[PDB]
Design a protein around this ligand. Structure first.
Ligand SMILES: CNC(=O)c1cc(NC(=O)c2cc(F)cc(C(F)(F)F)c2)c2c(c1)C(=O)N[C@H]2c1ccccc1C
Lengths: 1008, 270
C-alpha cells in the first residue's frame, strides 16, 4: 500500500524541500533531510518561521503537531513525532501545522494498526453500515475476555500466550516411535551458559520419555549433585529451587517448555525420537524469559462506548415477490449481444428453495425492467439463512446453432439482515465481476454485499414493505411449532442409517435415502456422524421441517472436529447448525489442530452470512489466547486484504486482533515493513530494470541492500514462516536474484540464537513476488495432513511439507531445504549412458557417494519410504505427472516434490512419477528391479498408504470443500473436487480401489 | 422397445456431466445412468424439479424394476414411460411432475467423411484455442486496467484532501492577515504588505500546481476507465462465441465416437 516514500518515488533524495503550512496563512519552504525526524522538522520550521510575516501569532512549538495526506489518502495526524520524514508514506511533501486534538495515545496506536492491516483505520469510522459499527463495538468483549484471561496469572499466563507449548495433540506415541527409545527412555542434553564469556556447558541425561519438564529439571540437578553428599530433604530443597526458578528452551529457536505436558509430546522431541536425533535443550532463567515479555495494556477505543412495533415472519400469509427495477453501467456491445435480462434464484446455501425466475429480456441500450418477480415459496417458509442470488445475463441467438446465455455480473443478498429482520423497501447494489472460468448464470457461493468499486454495474430492487418491520421468529415459537407439526426401533433400517454414515460428504444421496433419514431423524442421534447427511435431507423451504430440525440439533451429540468442520462449509448456512459446529470446535479442536486447519477455518469466514457470528468469535478468541495461531490468523487474513469482497470483513477482523494482540503488533509491523521493502525492490526489478541484464540487476540489488535504511529494516525480525525463527544479520554474500522470470529473491540470514550452532547457523528463505503461492500452501498443508495420518497408523513415510506462506496477492515466502538438489540437477552430476540418454543409475550412484558406509541402508530406506509417500500423494491429488526439475532429494535421501503452482498453471500423462532411476535406488542397483524383494515391500508401502488416506477420505474432501469461496480457480465448484473421489475410488469397495490403484502402479512404471 | 437403445439413457456418465446437462432446465427434464457404483443392472434417474437436480435410484429384483420396495415393472422403459403418461406423484406427492422432457444421447449433431474429424474438428478446435487465448489475454489486461484505475481513484482522493488543506490555508491567510494588511495600510508599510502578498501569491501559486496535477490525473483516469469498460464488453462479446464453438468442437467427437475409438484424436496428439 506504499510503493515508495512519496507518490511515484521510491526513495527521497538526501535533501528535499517541504511546504510547511502554519496556523497563520503563511507557507514556508524548509530544506530538510530524507530522514529528518518530525521533531527536527517542527523545531527548524518554528526557527525559520521568524523570517516570515505574522510570526507573532504562533504559539509555542510544543503545542502543535503536523498533519498531512498519506499515499493512502488519509489525512493523518502525526502524533508520533519520532518518525522520520521518509517513513510517513507522504503523498506530497507538505506538512500542515495544527493543534493536536483527540487522545494522543489512541491516534498513535491507530496509525500502527493501519500499517499492520494495510488500510487506514479511519476508513471504518466513515462506514454508514450499522452492521459494521455494531461489529466493531460488539466484538471488543471477546478481546477483553482474552486479555484478562491471559493477564490473569502474570507473568506465566502472559508467557503461555506468547510462547505456547508446541505439542502433538496426544501423548500416545505410536509404536514405531517408541521403538527408537532405549527401553522406554530417551537421552537428552541440557545446555547452560557460563557468562564471563558466554562459555557453555552441557549435561547429558537418560530419562523416561514421559517426564514433565520440571521432572527433567529434576533429573539434571540430580545428576550434578551426585557427589554433594546431600540429604533427601536438602535435595528436595534445591530441586524445588530449580523447578520453579528455571525453564527449558530449544537450542536455536524460541520454543519453551512452560507447561507440564509429557516431554515426548512436545513436537520438537517427538521428532528427535522419530528422526533419532539428539534433543538439545537450554536451561534458562525464568526471570530472563519474563523480562522479554513487556507488559501490554488493552484500552477500549472511542467507538466502543457511545451512540448519539414489529411482527413475526410467520404471520405473513403471502408468497414472496421481489421487484427488479433497472441496471446501470452495463458494459455490453449493443450489436454482438441481442438482449439482456436479470436472473434470480432464492437459495439456502446452494439448494434453490424454489425454481429460478427471470425478468423478461430487454435491449442492451435500456437496462430497465420494473418487473416484480414472483417466487414459488411462502414468506413463512423462508429459512433464516435464505439468500437472493441474482445476475445480469446476455443472450446471442442463432437457428443453425443454439441460443447462448452468459453472465455479465452477479450479486447476492441476505433476505434477513444481521438483526434477523426481513428486508423491505427499494434497494440498490453494485454487482461483482463474474469470476474467470465461471459460466453458471448465477454465483450462489459468492459473498453477499455490494461491490464498493465505482462505475460498476449497479442494480436496483424493491422488497415488499409489509405493513411493519418483520422479524424472524424467536426460538420459542419455533420449537412449539415443532410440537405442533410432530403431532401431524428397527434393524435393517438402522443398519443402512449407519451404512449411510460411512459414505463420504459428496456421495450421491438419492431421494429415497434423504426422506428415509428424515423419517428416522429421531433414531439418528444414536449415530451422530450422520448429522450432515440428515441436514441436506431437510426440505428447507418448509417451516414445518426446519422447525422440527432445530429441535434435533439443539440436543445433538457433539461430533468431533474433523466432522464438525463440514458444517462450516458453504452447504450449511443455518446459524443454528453453524453454532453447533463451532461449539464442537471450541470444546474438541486442540490449538494444534486449529493451527493445522487454520487456512480452512479462516476461509469459511467468507461463507458466514453476517460479520458477527459464533465462528469468527471462536477464531478471534483463540487467536488472542495463543500467539502462534494468532500469527498465521493475522497473515492469512492480511494475505487477502486486496480482495475487496472480503477486505471489509477481514479488515474489521484484523483491526480487532491488532488492537488486542498486545506487544506482538510491534513485531508484526517489523515483518510487514520488511516485506514492504522486499516487495518494493522486486517490483522495481520486475517493472523498471526488467530489461537490464542479470548482472546489472545483481548490482542494484546488493547496493540497494547495502543502504542502511534497508538493512535496519530487513535485519532483526521474526520469520513469518515460523515466528520462532529469529532472522538476524543478512548474508548479502549469499543473497541473490534467481533464474525464474519473476526473479524471486534467495534471502539468507544468520541465526542469532546464543546456541544457534545447535540447530542451523544461518537460515535462508525464498521471497517470490508475482506467483500465486496459495496452491503451494494448500498442497503443502495437505501433504502435512497425509504425513500425520500415516505416522499415526505406523507408516513411517517421511514427507517434506516445507514452509510456504502467502502474504498477499501473488507474493509470499518459501522455506529453502538445505543440502538438497533436483533430480534434473543430479542426472547432470552423472554421465550419458545411452545415445544422448542420461545414465539411469546416476541417481543411485550419487546417493551412494553421499552415503558411504553403514548409512547406505538408511538412505535407501528413507528414499523408498519418502518416494512411496509422494507417489501415493501426487496420484491422489492429480499432481502425478511432474518434471524431473520439480522433484527434489536431499543428501539425506529424502525425496519431495516442489513448485505445485507451476504444475497447475502448466496444465492449461502418467498416474505418478515412478521412473526407472527410482527403481535403481529402491532395489539397491539391481537388475529387473521390479522383481526383487525391496520393490516387493516398496509397493507394499504404497498400497498401505493409499487405503490409509481413503480411510480418512472424509477429512480431505471437507478441507477442500471449505476452500471453494477462496477464489482459487482450481476450487470453483464441487465438480472440481470430484477428481479426488475418482482417485480414492470412493464409489467402489476397498478391494476395488486397491485393484484400481494397482493397475495405475503397473501403468506408473510405464509397463510391467 | 429396448433400454440400451432409448433416447434418455446415457449410462456410463458422471454425476457432474448430468449436472452440466440439466443446468437451468425446466422442471421435468430427465436423464438416466447406471449408478456411479458402476454396478450391473443398477441404475440412477436424475430429473429436474424445483431448481434442483434430484436423484432417483432404480431398483432391480427377480427381473422386475421400480424405485421403491413394492417393485412392479418388467423393464426400465416400462417404468419410465408409465411416468411419462402420468405423474410420479403416484410415488411421492412431494414431487408432482411427469418425466416430461428427456435429454437424448443422440438427437444432437452438427456426408460424414473422416475429414469431419481430421479436418473439421481440428478446425473447430484451432478456432477454439485462439478465442480462448484472446479471452485469457483480455482478462489479463482487464484485471491490469482494473487495478491501475483504483490506484488513480485513491490518488485523486489524496489530491482532494491536500487541496482541502490548502484551500483552508487560503481562508486562514485571509482571516489572520486582513487586519494586519489594514493596519499596515495606514502605517504606510507597503514593504510589509508585499511580504504577506508575496507569500500569499506563493501559496495560491502552488495550490494551482497541485490542482493542475489533479485534473491531469482525472484525465488519465477518465480515459483509462473508458478503455476499461471497452475491455469488459469485449469479453462479454467473446464469452458466448467461445462457448458456442467449444461445444461444436466437443460434439464433433461424436463421429470419433461413431468410429468408436480415439485413435484419431491421438493422431492429433502425435
Ligand atoms: C492430471 N491432473 C488432473 O487431471 C487433475 C488434477 C487436480 N488437482 C488439483 O487441481 C489440485 C491438487 C492439489 F494438491 C492442490 C490444488 C490447489 F488447490 F492448491 F490448487 C489443486 C484436479 C483435477 C484434475 C480436478 O478435476 N480437480 C482437481 C483436484 C483434485 C484433487 C483434490 C482437489 C482438487 C481441486
Amino acid at each position: 500500500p506504499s510503493s515508495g516514500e512519496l507518490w511515484g518515488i521510491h526513495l527521497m533524495p538526501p535533501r528535499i524541500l517541504v511546504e510547511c503550512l502554519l496556523p497563520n496563512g503563511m507557507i514556508v519552504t524548509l530544506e530538510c533531510l530524507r530522514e529528518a525526524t518530525l521533531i527536527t522538522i517542527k523545531h527548524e520550521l518554528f526557527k525559520e518561521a521568524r523570517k516570515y510575516p505574522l510570526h507573532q501569532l504562533l504559539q509555542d512549538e510544543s503545542s502543535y503537531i503536523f498533519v498531512s495526506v498519506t499515499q493512502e489518502a488519509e489525512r493523518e495526524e502525526f502524533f508520533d513525532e519520532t518518525r522520520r520524514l521518509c517513513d510517513l508514506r507522504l503523498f506530497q511533501p507538505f506538512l500542515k501545522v495544527i493543534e493536536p486534538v483527540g487522545n494522543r495515545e489512541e491516534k498513535i496506536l491507530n496509525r500502527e494498526i493501519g500499517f499492520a492491516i494495510g488500510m487506514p483505520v479511519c476508513e471504518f469510522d466513515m462506514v454508514k453500515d450499522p452492521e459494521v459499527q455494531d461489529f466493531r463495538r460488539n466484538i471488543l468483549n471477546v478481546c477483553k475476555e482474552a486479555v484478562d484471561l491471559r493477564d490473569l496469572n502474570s507473568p506465566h499466563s502472559r508467557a503461555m500466550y506468547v510462547y505456547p507449548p508446541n505439542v502433538e495433540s496426544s501423548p500416545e506415541l505410536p509404536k514405531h516411535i517408541y521403538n527408537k527409545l532405549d527401553k522406554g527412555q530417551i537421552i537428552v542434553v541440557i545446555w547452560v551458559i557460563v557468562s564471563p564469556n558466554n562459555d557453555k556447558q552441557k549435561y547429558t541425561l537418560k530419562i523416561n520419555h514421559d517426564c514433565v519438564p520440571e521432572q527433567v529439571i529434576a533429573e539434571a540437578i540430580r545428576k550434578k549433585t551426585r557427589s554433594m553428599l546431600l540429604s533427601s530433604e536438602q535435595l528436595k530443597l534445591c530441586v524445588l529451587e530449580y523447578q520453579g526458578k528455571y525453564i527449558l528452551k530449544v537450542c536455536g529457536c524460541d520454543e519453551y517448555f512452560l507447561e507440564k505436558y509429557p516431554l515426548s509430546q512436545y513436537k520438537y522431541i517427538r521428532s528427535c525420537i522419530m528422526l533419532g536425533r539428539m534433543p538439545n535443550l537450554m536451561l534458562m532463567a525464568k526471570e530472563s524469559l519474563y523480562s522479554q515479555l513487556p507488559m501490554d495494556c488493552f484500552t477500549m477505543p472511542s467507538y466502543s462506548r457511545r451512540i448519539s412495533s414489529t411482527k413475526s415472519l410467520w404471520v405473513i400469509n403471502s408468497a414472496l415477490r421481489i421487484k427488479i427495477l433497472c441496471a446501470t453501467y452495463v458494459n455490453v456491445n449493443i450489436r454482438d449481444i441481442d438482449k439482456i435480462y436479470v436472473r434470480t434464484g432464492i437459495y439456502h446455501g446452494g439448494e434453490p428453495l424454489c425454481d429460478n425466475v427471470n425478468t423478461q429480456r430487454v435491449p442492451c441500450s435500456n437496462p430497465r425492467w420494473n418487473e416484480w418477480l414472483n417466487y414459488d415459496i411462502y414468506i413463512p417458509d423462508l429459512p433464516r439463512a435464505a439468500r437472493l442470488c441474482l445476475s445480469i445475463c446476455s443472450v446471442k441467438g442463432r437457428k443453425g446453432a443454439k441460443e447462448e446465455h452468459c453472465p455479465l455480473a452477479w450479486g447476492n443478498i441476505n433476505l434477513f439482515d444481521y438483526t434477523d429482520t426481513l428486508v423491505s423497501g427499494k434497494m440498490a447494489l453494485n454487482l461483482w465481476p463474474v469470476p474467470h472460468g465461471l459460466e453458471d448464470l448465477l454465483n450462489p457461493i459468492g459473498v453477499t454485499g455490494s461491490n464498493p468499486n465505482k462505475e460498476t454495474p449497479c442494480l436496483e430492487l424493491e422488497f415488499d414493505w409489509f405493513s411493519s418491520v418483520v422479524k424472524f421468529p424467536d426460538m420459542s415459537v419455533i420449537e412449539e411449532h415443532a410440537n405442533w407439526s410432530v403431532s401431524r426401533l428397527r434393524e435393517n433400517d438402522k443398519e443402512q442409517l449407519k451404512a449411510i454414515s460411512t459414505r463420504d460428504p459428496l456421495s450421491e444421496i438419492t431421494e429415497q435415502e434423504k426422506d428415509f433419514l428424515w423419517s428416522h431423524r429421531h433414531y439418528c442421534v444414536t449415530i451422530p456422524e450422520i448429522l450432515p447427511k440428515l441436514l441436506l435431507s431437510v426440505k428447507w423451504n418448509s417451516r414445518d421441517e426446519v422447525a422440527q430440525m432445530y429441535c434435533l440439533v439443539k440436543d445433538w451429540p457433539p461430533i468431533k472436529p474433523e466432522q464438525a468442520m463440514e458444517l462450516l462449509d458453504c452447504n450449511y448456512p443455518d446459524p443454528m447448525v453453524r453454532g453447533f459446529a463451532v461449539r464442537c470446535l471450541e470444546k474438541y479442536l486442540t490449538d494444534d489442530k486449529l493451527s493445522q486447519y487454520l487456512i480452512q477455518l479462516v476461509q469459511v469466514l467468507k461463507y458466514e452470512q453476517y460479520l458477527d457470528n459464533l465462528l469468527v468469535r471462536f477464531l478471534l478468541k483463540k487467536a488472542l489466547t495463543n500467539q502462534r495461531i494468532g500469527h498465521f490468523f493475522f497473515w492469512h487474513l492480511k494475505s487477502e486484504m486486496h480482495n475487496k469482497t472480503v477486505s471489509q470483513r477481514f479488515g474489521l477482523l484484523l483491526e480487532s486482533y491488532c488492537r488486542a494482540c498486545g506487544m506482538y503488533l510491534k513485531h508484526l509491523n517489523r515483518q510487514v515493513e520488511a516485506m514492504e521493502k522486499l516487495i518494493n525492490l522486486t517490483d522495481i526489478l520486475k517493472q523498471e530494470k526488467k530489461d537490464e541484464t542479470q548482472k546489472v540487476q545483481m548490482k542494484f540489488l546488493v547496493e540497494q541492500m547495502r543502504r542502511p535504511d534497508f538493512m535496519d529494516a530487513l535485519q532483526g525480525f521474526l520469520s513469518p514462516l515460523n515466528p520462532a525463527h529469529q532472522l538476524g544479520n543478512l548474508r548479502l554474500e549469499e543473497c541473490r536474484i534467481m533464474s525464474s522470470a519473476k526473479r524471486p529473491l534467495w534471502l539468507n540470514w544468520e541465526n542469532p540464537d546464543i546456541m544457534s550452532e545447535l540447530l542451523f547457523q544461518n537460515n535462508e528463505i525464498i521471497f517470490k513476488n508475482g506467483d500465486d503461492l496459495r496452491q503451494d500452501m494448500l498442497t503443502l498443508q495437505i501433504i502435512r495432513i497425509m504425513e500425520n495420518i500415516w505416522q499415526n497408523q505406523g507408516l513411517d513415510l517421511r514427507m517434506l511439507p516445507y514452509g510456504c506462506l502467502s502474504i498477499g496477492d501473488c507474493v509470499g515466502l518459501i522455506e529453502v531445504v538445505r543440502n538438497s538438489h533436483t533430480i534434473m540437477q543430479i542426472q547432470c552430476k552423472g554421465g550419458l549412458k545411452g545415445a544422448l540418454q542420461f545414465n539411469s543409475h546416476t541417481l543411485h550412484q550419487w546417493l551412494k557417494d553421499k552415503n558411504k558406509g553403514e548409512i547406505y541402508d538408511a538412505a535407501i530406506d528413507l528414499f523408498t519410504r519418502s518416494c512411496a509417500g509422494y507417489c501415493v500423494a501426487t496420484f491422489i491429488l492429480g499432481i502425478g505427472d511432474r518434471h524431473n526439475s520439480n522433484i527434489m532429494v536431499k543428501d539425506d535421501g529424502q525425496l519431495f516434490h516442489i513448485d505445485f503452482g507451476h504444475f497447475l498453471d502448466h496444465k492449461k500423462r502418467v498416474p505418478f512419477v515412478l521412473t526407472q532411476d527410482f527403481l535403481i535406488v529402491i532395489s539397491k542397483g539391481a537388475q529387473e528391479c521390479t522383481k526383487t524383494r525391496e520393490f516387493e515391500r516398496f509397493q507394499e508401502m504404497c498400497y498401505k498408504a493409499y487405503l490409509a488416506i481413503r480411510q480418512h477420505a472424509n477429512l480431505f474432501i471437507n478441507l477442500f470443500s471449505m476452500m471453494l469461496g477462496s477464489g482459487m480457480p482450481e476450487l470453483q465448484s464441487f465438480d472440481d473436487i470430484a477428481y479426488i473421489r475418482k482417485t480414492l475410488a470412493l464409489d467402489k469397495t476397498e478391494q476395488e480401489a486397491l485393484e484400481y490403484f494397482m493397475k495405475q502402479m503397473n501403468d506408473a512404471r510405464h509397463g510391467g | 422397445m429396448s433400454l440400451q437403445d432409448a433416447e434418455w439413457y446415457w449410462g456410463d456418465i458422471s454425476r457432474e456431466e448430468v449436472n452440466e446437462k440439466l443446468r437451468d432446465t425446466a422442471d421435468g427434464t430427465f436423464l438416466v445412468r447406471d449408478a456411479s457404483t458402476k454396478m450391473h443392472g443398477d441404475y440412477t434417474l436424475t430429473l429436474r424439479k424445483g431448481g434442483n437436480n434430484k436423484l432417483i435410484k432404480i431398483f432391480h429384483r427377480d427381473g422386475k424394476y421400480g424405485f421403491s420396495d413394492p417393485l412392479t415393472f418388467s423393464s426400465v422403459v416400462e417404468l419410465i414411460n408409465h411416468y411419462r403418461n402420468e405423474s410420479l406423484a403416484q410415488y411421492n406427492p412431494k414431487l408432482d411432475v411427469k418425466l416430461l422432457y428427456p435429454v437424448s444421447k443422440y438427437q444432437q449433431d452438427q456426408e460424414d467423411n473422416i475429414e469431419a474429424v481430421g479436418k473439421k474438428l481440428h478446425e473447430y478446435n484451432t478456432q477454439f484455442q485462439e478465442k480462448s487465448r484472446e479471452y485469457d489475454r483480455l482478462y489479463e489486461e482487464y484485471t491490469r486496467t482494473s487495478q491501475e484505475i483504483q490506484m488513480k481513484r485513491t490518488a485523486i482522493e489524496a489530491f482532494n484532501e491536500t487541496i482541502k488543506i490548502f484551500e483552508e490555508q487560503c481562508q486562514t491567510q485571509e482571516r489572520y492577515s486582513k487586519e494586519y494588511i489594514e493596519k499596515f495600510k495606514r502605517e504606510g508599510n507597503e514593504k510589509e504588505i508585499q511580504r504577506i502578498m508575496h507569500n500569499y501569491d506563493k501559496l495560491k501559486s502552488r495550490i494551482s500546481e497541485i490542482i493542475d496535477s489533479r485534473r491531469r490525473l482525472e484525465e488519465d483516469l477518465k480515459k483509462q476507465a473508458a478503455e476499461y469498460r471497452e475491455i469488459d464488453k469485449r469479453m462479454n462479446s467473446i464469452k458466448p462465441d467461445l462457448i458456442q464453438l467449444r461445444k461444436t468442437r466437443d460434439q464433433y467427437l461424436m463421429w470419433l465416437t461413431q468410429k468408436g475409438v480415439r485413435q484419431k484424436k491421438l493422431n492429433e496428439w502425435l
